[PDB]
Ligand binder design. Structure first.
Ligand SMILES: CC(=O)N[C@H]1[C@H](O[C@H]2[C@H](O)[C@@H](NC(C)=O)[C@@H](OP(=O)(O)OP(=O)(O)OCC[C@H](C)CC/C=C(/C)CC/C=C(/C)CCC=C(C)C)O[C@@H]2CO)O[C@H](CO)[C@@H](O[C@@H]2O[C@H](CO[C@H]3O[C@H](CO)[C@@H](O)[C@H](O[C@H]4O[C@H](CO)[C@@H](O)[C@H](O)[C@@H]4O)[C@@H]3O)[C@@H](O)[C@H](O[C@H]3O[C@H](CO)[C@@H](O)[C@H](O)[C@@H]3O[C@H]3O[C@H](CO)[C@@H](O)[C@H](O)[C@@H]3O[C@H]3O[C@H](CO)[C@@H](O)[C@H](O[C@H]4O[C@H](CO)[C@@H](O)[C@H](O[C@H]5O[C@H](CO)[C@@H](O)[C@H](O)[C@H]5O[C@H]5O[C@H](CO)[C@@H](O)[C@H](O)[C@H]5O)[C@H]4O)[C@@H]3O)[C@@H]2O)[C@@H]1O
Ligand SMILES: *[C@@H]1O[C@H](CO)[C@@H](O[C@@H]2O[C@H](CO)[C@@H](O[C@@H]3O[C@H](CO[C@H]4O[C@H](CO)[C@@H](O)[C@H](O)[C@@H]4O)[C@@H](O)[C@H](O[C@H]4O[C@H](CO)[C@@H](O)[C@H](O)[C@@H]4O[C@H]4O[C@H](CO)[C@@H](O)[C@H](O)[C@@H]4O[C@H]4O[C@H](CO)[C@@H](O)[C@H](O)[C@@H]4O)[C@@H]3O)[C@H](O)[C@H]2NC(C)=O)[C@H](O)[C@H]1NC(C)=O
Lengths: 57, 109
């Protein structure tokens, strides 16, 4: 009884899209990085001395 | 033993960083370049996932590369190499940094 009757339907099974983190956590970390950049930029100008003495003339 | 070499080296270090102002700028930069790398690694741990591995690496390597280039500058700036002056050792640093920044903005996609 080969290839004489209707055949069972086949459906492809797909994979899953990788999970992305919730935007609140990413926003928190982006804020941490921004604060770190600001702290560096102010450590240069405050505790450390970026004199800006010899501006060319 | 160790606890003494500690104070000895701290003394020497702070002496040098005070004597030459520029050798503090690089140091501050290097310190923060560590922090940023640590932050990224902490993120990778907090979520136990590294889905954009291209992005993660492009963000970690720009820090490692900038750190090593800064240290090469600090070594070429504390005691100049025979045929390279302080100037040429800053222009070479700039060129290498720009190339690193490009390949890193191309990696993250
Ligand atoms: C014999 C031989 O050899 N063979 C070989 C060959 O060879 C040949 C050649 O070729 C030729 N040439 C021509 C031109 O022609 C010739 O030659 P000659 O002559 O020789 O020449 P040369 O070579 O040049 O010469 C040489 C020279 C010498 C070497 C010299 C030497 C000298 C001296 C002196 C010495 C030195 C040294 C030393 C050491 C010493 C020193 C000193 C001291 C030490 C002291 O001829 C030859 C011969 O004749 O070739 C070929 C090639 O071409 C090859 O093949 C290949 O292989 C590979 C490998 O394999 C391996 O592994 C594997 C795994 O992997 C396995 O499986 C296998 O196994 C196998 O085998 C074994 C044995 O046999 C067996 O047992 C088993 O069973 C099996 O069978 C092995 O183990 C492989 O792989 C391949 O395959 C591939 O391909 C294909 C195409 O068609 C396909 O189909 C498949 O599928 C595959 O695929 C894959 O891959 C690829 C690439 O590769 C791609 O495209 C695709 O797509 C796929 O991929 C996929 O999957 C994978 C897994 O599965 C994965 O991984 C991936 O993923 C990745 O990627 C992607 C894309 O790119 C991406 O996307 C991703 O990423 C993503 O995801 C991730 C995760 O999640 C994340 O993380 C990230 O993030 C992401 O990303 C993404 O997304 C984002 C957003 O979101 C964005 O943004 C971005 O963009 C994106 O990306 C990743 O992950 C995918 O999935 C083949 O097979 C053969 O073998
Ligand atoms: C290098 O070249 C070689 C040869 O040129 C390539 O190798 C070929 O690769 C083919 C696919 O990668 C492979 O075909 C598969 O073989 C599987 C095993 O076959 C053997 O065992 C079965 C019994 O299990 C025997 O009947 C058979 O004769 C062999 O002895 C089959 O299991 C595969 O069948 C499934 O896929 C085909 C094609 O999609 C369907 O028609 C079939 O109905 C099966 O479909 C199930 O799975 C798919 C997903 O794959 C589902 O979408 C579908 O809905 C079905 O899902 C049900 O079943 C699964 C469990 O199977 C279950 O999880 C799900 O929930 C559902 O219940 C298929 O026949 C060739 O044999 C192989 N050839 C050789 C010689 O090795 C090789 O790829 C090349 N290398 C590359 C490209 O890198």
């Amino acid at each position: 009884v080969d290839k004489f009757g209707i055949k069972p339907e086949i459906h492809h099974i797909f994979h899953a899209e990788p999970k992305r983190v919730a935007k609140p956590i990413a926003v928190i970390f982006v804020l941490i990085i921004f604060i770190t950049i600001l702290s560096l930029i102010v450590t240069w100008l405050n505790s450390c001395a970026a004199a800006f003495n010899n501006i060319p003339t | 033993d160790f606890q003494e070499t500690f104070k000895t080296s701290k003394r020497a270090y702070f002496a040098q960083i005070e004597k030459y102002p520029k050798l503090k700028l690089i140091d501050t930069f290097c310190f923060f370049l560590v922090l940023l790398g640590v932050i990224q690694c902490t993120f990778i741990i907090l979520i136990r996932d590294n889905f954009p591995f291209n992005a993660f690496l492009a963000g970690f390597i720009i820090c490692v590369g900038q750190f090593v280039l800064l240290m090469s500058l600090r070594l070429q700036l504390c005691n100049s190499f025979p045929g390279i002056s302080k100037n040429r050792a800053f222009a070479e640093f700039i060129v290498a940094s720009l190339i690193l920044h490009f390949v890193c903005l191309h990696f993250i996609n």
